[PDB]
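Hi W., the zinc ion complex you wanted:
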Amino acid sequence: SGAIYVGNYRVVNRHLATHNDWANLVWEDSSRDLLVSSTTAQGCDTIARCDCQTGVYYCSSRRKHYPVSFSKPSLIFVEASEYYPARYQSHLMLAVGHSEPGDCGGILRCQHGVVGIVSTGGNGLVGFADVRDLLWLDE
Ligand SMILES: N#Cc1ncncc1CC(=O)N1CCC[C@H](C(N)=O)C1
Ligand SMILES: [Zn+2]
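Structure:
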């Protein structure tokens, strides 16, 4: 679990979105595993606007942060699930690091701010849904 709070927006993994997120829907993309909902309270997360390939992510299954090198956002394979059939997920970045079920939503940050959130895992790889291209989050 986990979310990004910027302005009047809440960014969450689409597969973990609540009834409240869907009733206050702003935008969602199944191919990215992202959903953004509106909030009453003001958020203060800073979104990174960069091409960093290094950062630190929070891993809830170890209660630890890990430094990682990660790939550029691209179209990449997942496996099926209560939530998706096998498919390419777009805007996904991989890193060698630890993840397993429940680690989705952990934030990945670089020196510029929030880069994305954990969205996939397995085989000693962790995948992050990028949010750096969503320029509208700031306005
Ligand atoms: N996190 C994690 C994890 N770590 C290890 N094994 C499996 C997983 C689970 C996983 O990858 N997914 C299940 C939920 C939906 C995800 C998606 N974006 O399509 C895929
Ligand atoms: Zn950066």
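Residues 3-44 form one domain.

W.
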